[PDB]
Amino acid sequence: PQAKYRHDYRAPDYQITDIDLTFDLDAQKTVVTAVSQAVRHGASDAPLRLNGEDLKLVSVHINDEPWTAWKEEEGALVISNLPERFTLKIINEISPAANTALEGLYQSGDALCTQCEAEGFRHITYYLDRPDVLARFTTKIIADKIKYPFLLSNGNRVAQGELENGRHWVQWQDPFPKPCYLFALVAGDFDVLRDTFTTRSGREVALELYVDRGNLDRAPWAMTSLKNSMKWDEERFGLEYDLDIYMIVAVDFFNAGAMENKGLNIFNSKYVLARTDTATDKDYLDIERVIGHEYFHNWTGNRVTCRDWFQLSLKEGLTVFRDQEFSSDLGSRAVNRINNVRTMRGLQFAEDASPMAHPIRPDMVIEMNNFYTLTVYEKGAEVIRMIHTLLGEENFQKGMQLYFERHDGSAATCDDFVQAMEDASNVDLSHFRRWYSQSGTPIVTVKDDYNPETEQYTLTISQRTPATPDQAEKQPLHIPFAIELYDNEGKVIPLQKGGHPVNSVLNVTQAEQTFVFDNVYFQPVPALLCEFSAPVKLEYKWSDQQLTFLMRHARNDFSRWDAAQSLLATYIKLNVARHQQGQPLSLPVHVADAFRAVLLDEKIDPALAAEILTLPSVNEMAELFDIIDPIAIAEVREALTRTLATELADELLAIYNANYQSEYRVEHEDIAKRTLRNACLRFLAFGETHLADVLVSKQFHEANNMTDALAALSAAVAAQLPCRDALMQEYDDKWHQNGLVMDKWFILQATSPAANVLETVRGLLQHRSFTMSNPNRIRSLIGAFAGSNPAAFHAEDGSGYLFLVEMLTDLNSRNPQVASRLIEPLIRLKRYDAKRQEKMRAALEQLKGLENLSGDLYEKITKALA
Ligand code: MET
Ligand code: MET
Numbered sequence: 001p002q003a004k005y006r007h008d009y010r011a012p013d014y015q016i017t018d019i020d021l022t023f024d025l026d027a028q029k030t031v032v033t034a035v036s037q038a039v040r041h042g043a044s045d046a047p048l049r050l051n052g053e054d055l056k057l058v059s060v061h062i063n064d065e066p067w068t069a070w071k072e073e074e075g076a077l078v079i080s081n082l083p084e085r086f087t088l089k090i091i092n093e094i095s096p097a098a099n100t101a102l103e104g105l106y107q108s109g110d111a112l113c114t115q116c117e118a119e120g121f122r123h124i125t126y127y128l129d130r131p132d133v134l135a136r137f138t139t140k141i142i143a144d145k146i147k148y149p150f151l152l153s154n155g156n157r158v159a160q161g162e163l164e165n166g167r168h169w170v171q172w173q174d175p176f177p178k179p180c181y182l183f184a185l186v187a188g189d190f191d192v193l194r195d196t197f198t199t200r201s202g203r204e205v206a207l208e209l210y211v212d213r214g215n216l217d218r219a220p221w222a223m224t225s226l227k228n229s230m231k232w233d234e235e236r237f238g239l240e241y242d243l244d245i246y247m248i249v250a251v252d253f254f255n256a257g258a259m260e261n262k263g264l265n266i267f268n269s270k271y272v273l274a275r276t277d278t279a280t281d282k283d284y285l286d287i288e289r290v291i292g293h294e295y296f297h298n299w300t301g302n303r304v305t306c307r308d309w310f311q312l313s314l315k316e317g318l319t320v321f322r323d324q325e326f327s328s329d330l331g332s333r334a335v336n337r338i339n340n341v342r343t344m345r346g347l348q349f350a351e352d353a354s355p356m357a358h359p360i361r362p363d364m365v366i367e368m369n370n371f372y373t374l375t376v377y378e379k380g381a382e383v384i385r386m387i388h389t390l391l392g393e394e395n396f397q398k399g400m401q402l403y404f405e406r407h408d409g410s411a412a413t414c415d416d417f418v419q420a421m422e423d424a425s426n427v428d429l430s431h432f433r434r435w436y437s438q439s440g441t442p443i444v445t446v447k448d449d450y451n452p453e454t455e456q457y458t459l460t461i462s463q464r465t466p467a468t469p470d471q472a473e474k475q476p477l478h479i480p481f482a483i484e485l486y487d488n489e490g491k492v493i494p495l496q497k498g499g500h501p502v503n504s505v506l507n508v509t510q511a512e513q514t515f516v517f518d519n520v521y522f523q524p525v526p527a528l529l530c531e532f533s534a535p536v537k538l539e540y541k542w543s544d545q546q547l548t549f550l551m552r553h554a555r556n557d558f559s560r561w562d563a564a565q566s567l568l569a570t571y572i573k574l575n576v577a578r579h580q581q582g583q584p585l586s587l588p589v590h591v592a593d594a595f596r597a598v599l600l601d602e603k604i605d606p607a608l609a610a611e612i613l614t615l616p617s618v619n620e621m622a623e624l625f626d627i628i629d630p631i632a633i634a635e636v637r638e639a640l641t642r643t644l645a646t647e648l649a650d651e652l653l654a655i656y657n658a659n660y661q662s663e664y665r666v667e668h669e670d671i672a673k674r675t676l677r678n679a680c681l682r683f684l685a686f687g688e689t690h691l692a693d694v695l696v697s698k699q700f701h702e703a704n705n706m707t708d709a710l711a712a713l714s715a716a717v718a719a720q721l722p723c724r725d726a727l728m729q730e731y732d733d734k735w736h737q738n739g740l741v742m743d744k745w746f747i748l749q750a751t752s753p754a755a756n757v758l759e760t761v762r763g764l765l766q767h768r769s770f771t772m773s774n775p776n777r778i779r780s781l782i783g784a785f786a787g788s789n790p791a792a793f794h795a796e797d798g799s800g801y802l803f804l805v806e807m808l809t810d811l812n813s814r815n816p817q818v819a820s821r822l823i824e825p826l827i828r829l830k831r832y833d834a835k836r837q838e839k840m841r842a843a844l845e846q847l848k849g850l851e852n853l854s855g856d857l858y859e860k861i862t863k864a865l866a
């Protein structure tokens with residue numbers, strides 16, 4: 001399988017303007033008739049090259065003439081000797097029931113549904129399956145009325161009828177030209193939740209949420225979130241919905257999260273279905289985020305789309321930025337920013353240091369479904385946020401407005417978006433564009449000097465990005481480096497130089513530079529890289545007291561959290577080294593006291609307190625090290641938890657009890673209190689065993705909501721408490737029929753610290769709630785083992801690797817996209833010690849030799865083994 005290169009992009013030889021699709025729908029054999037209106041742009045002797053995968057070609061006509069000048073080749077139908085303008089008609093057959101990869105047209109339970117992004121439409125018919133070809137679609141669907149009473153596609157119903165032998169049909173038209181990745185089709189029998197939204201200018205929108213029969217009780221929050229999304233995009237970005245109907249279909253079988261098909265979004269049911277006894281507060285907030293994300297794509301992705309797949313971040317970085325802003329505006333901005341930083345520093349930094357490292361606009365792709373990444377998405381959004389930092393909200397919105405004014409109705413590039421921002425704002429983003437083309441995480445080193453004679457504070461800042469496997473050359477970036485200086489009372493020192501105010505966003509644009517601030521009347525305590533103002537590793541020599549001071553005084557909630565993270569880092573590193581020497585945990589009393597003070601501070605927002613009291617995950621801990629020791633990290637995190645539970649036992653219990661809430665409500669203040677209460681419970685679980693067991697069991701049995709029940713269950717598992725087996729069996733007996741709820745239970749099984757976790761995990765491959773046919777189940781049991789239980793995944797006997805090899809041997813043939821998700825932990829081998837690395841390499845070499853190795857795995861394996 002051959003790599004494609006961004007620099008090889010060229011305008012298409014042919015365009016398709018209009019396409020009329022007919023589906024004679026049947027699970028075993030679907031017949032597709034596609035009538036396309038084509039126009040030649042290239043040379044008169046150029047053939048039309050159509051993409052197609054696993055199609056049975058029945059016929060080819062050009063202006064109703066059965067065509068002879070064509071041939072099929074690998075992945076293609078090549079049609080020669082064409083007029084300049086013509087009607088192409090293809091008839092072909094496909095088999096949705098055989099489609100286990102869930103790309104193209106497939107089955108989800110008894111429903112038929114599609115997933116076309118990135119290159120799935122070519123599994124449906126022979127087409128120009130590239131996103132710079134935009135066409136107006138009309139779609140006729142013919143099916144058995146009893147089995148498929150709802151027949152849905154993009155847009156509005158323009159025709160409908162009934163036929164003999166129990167068949168019926170519906171035809172749909174969507175007036176907006178679209179790339180085929182935005183096509184969708186759904187057929188099935190559903191319950192439907194119906195509502196309305198009226199846009200600010202008065203357009204009335206019918207809202208329709210399709211769910212499996214029996215699930216209406218879990219649909220209102222998603223509907224509410226849709227309306228919230230639509231209102232917010234009007235208030236924040238001045239954007240209204242542009243169609244008459246907004247359909248969302250929740251399907252149980254779906255490889256990713258959800259999909260922005262124009263007017264007909266298709267969602268993994270995990271990001272739709274919630275009731276207070278099935279879904280946690282975090283599930284509610286994730287539903288909100290994802291519903292919003294896909295809605296936001298209506299402008300950032302659909303009204304302006306991507307010229308080619310290398311420009312993916314153009315829609316994904318920007319839409320992720322939008323979802324974050326939506327979440328942050330509606331909820332706790334601090335808690336949002338904190339969690340997005342945790343993901344950046346703990347998961348995305350890992351990718352940027354891996355063999356799969358790529359810039360946010362990639363240069364080289366073998367399998368495009370491998371580039372829906374933390375980098376494209378999350379780092380992408382950090383790049384959009386840097387623009388926002390450099391421009392300010394008002395100029396950023398001017399840029400958005402110019403972007404849509406120039407590019408509405410077309411397929412644009414990352415560079416087009418940057419130019420709109422630069423042109424609208426008059427901020428020069430020439431150097432800034434390097435963030436699109438350079439991979440790896442920059443390291444920003446800061447030295448400081450205070451001159452008591454002149455009352456000047458000097459920062460010397462340097463940057464470099466280490467080489468990555470994809471790029472041997474690196475150059476300095478335009479890094480917006482936000483600072484704040486604090487005096488001995490915790491007041492902000494005005495930034496100024498030579499009698500003039502100085503912006504607190506420093507432009508760090510060279511390998512090394514100095515910044516001098518005047519009238520610095522007291523030796524400052526700096527807050528550096530405020531709000532994580534650029535996606536960089538910060539190297540500054542902090543004292544413990546500078547950090548504890550920030551925890552007490554910093555103006556931005558994020559800064560308080562971040563200071564706590566830097567304080568902990570030092571002692572995580574210390575204790576990993578101690579673990580390797582066989583020694584007990586060591587922690588200065590003044591560090592425990594800083595956390596004691598957070599617990600007792602009444603003026604701190606509980607949302608913030610909770611995050612300060614949530615230790616870095618094992619992923620975030622791993623980023624602190626060059627060579628990862630996954631067993632030390634896991635054991636250190638547990639030991640640190642136990643030490644704090646002991647030292648802060650009284651305070652923990654007091655705050656746990658103070659934050660009790662007898663009413664459950666899905667409201668942000670109430671969520672914050674619960675997160676604080678449950679952060680306390682996590683420590684309490686690891687305290688004295690009998691008190692722990694009682695507290696955890698009681699919370700699980702008395703819980704009136706899944707947030708509180710799961711927090712208790714999860715603590716019973718993490719601390720291996722006596723009640724654990726009974727509680728886990730109770731959850732299974734109650735919830736086994738509900739796959740989404742059992743996903744949480746599979747995650748706890750997968751991530752259990754028990755000595756025999758892998759034996760238990762293999763046993764669960766036969767559990768009544770598990771199936772290898774369902775991506776969510778795979779991810780919750782197998783994925784979570786490999787990716788979130790590094791101590792067990794990286795067991796010294798290599799048993800973790802062998803397990804994953806066996807699962808991937810199945811998944812490579814069944815569902816290569818889920819396979820490629822699950823292989824990611826093996827491709828990190830060079831971060832591990834020699835002996836682990838050798839076993840991981842042997843596992844990768846076994847997978848490299850699979851018969852019919854998928855392109856998805858091949859890409860990753862070849863990079864990892866280089
Ligand atoms: C490759 S699956 C499609 C992902 C979808 N565009 C999203 O943003 O969630
Ligand atoms: C944080 S300002 C102090 C910088 C340095 N320790 C000095 O004494 O100049």
Ligand code: MET
Nearest residue numbers: 277700701702703706709
């Ligand atoms: C929402 S999980 C079920 C929890 C319930 N308190 C029980 O003991 O069964």
Ligand code: MET
Nearest residue numbers: 717725728748749752760
């Ligand atoms: C993670 S709970 C421990 C496993 C449990 N005893 C079981 O067999 O399912």
Ligand code: NA
Nearest residue numbers: 020021022033
């Ligand atoms: Na047709």
Ligand code: NA
Nearest residue numbers: 015016017134
């Ligand atoms: Na077109």
Ligand code: NA
Nearest residue numbers: 198199200231
């Ligand atoms: Na209104």
Ligand code: NA
Nearest residue numbers: 328329331333
């Ligand atoms: Na907010």
Ligand code: NA
Nearest residue numbers: 339342611614
């Ligand atoms: Na968190």
Ligand code: NA
Nearest residue numbers: 449450451452
């Ligand atoms: Na000095």
Ligand code: NA
Nearest residue numbers: 539540541542
């Ligand atoms: Na440091």
Ligand code: NA
Nearest residue numbers: 766767768770
């Ligand atoms: Na099963």
Ligand SMILES: [Zn+2]
Nearest residue numbers: 293297316319
């Ligand atoms: Zn998206």
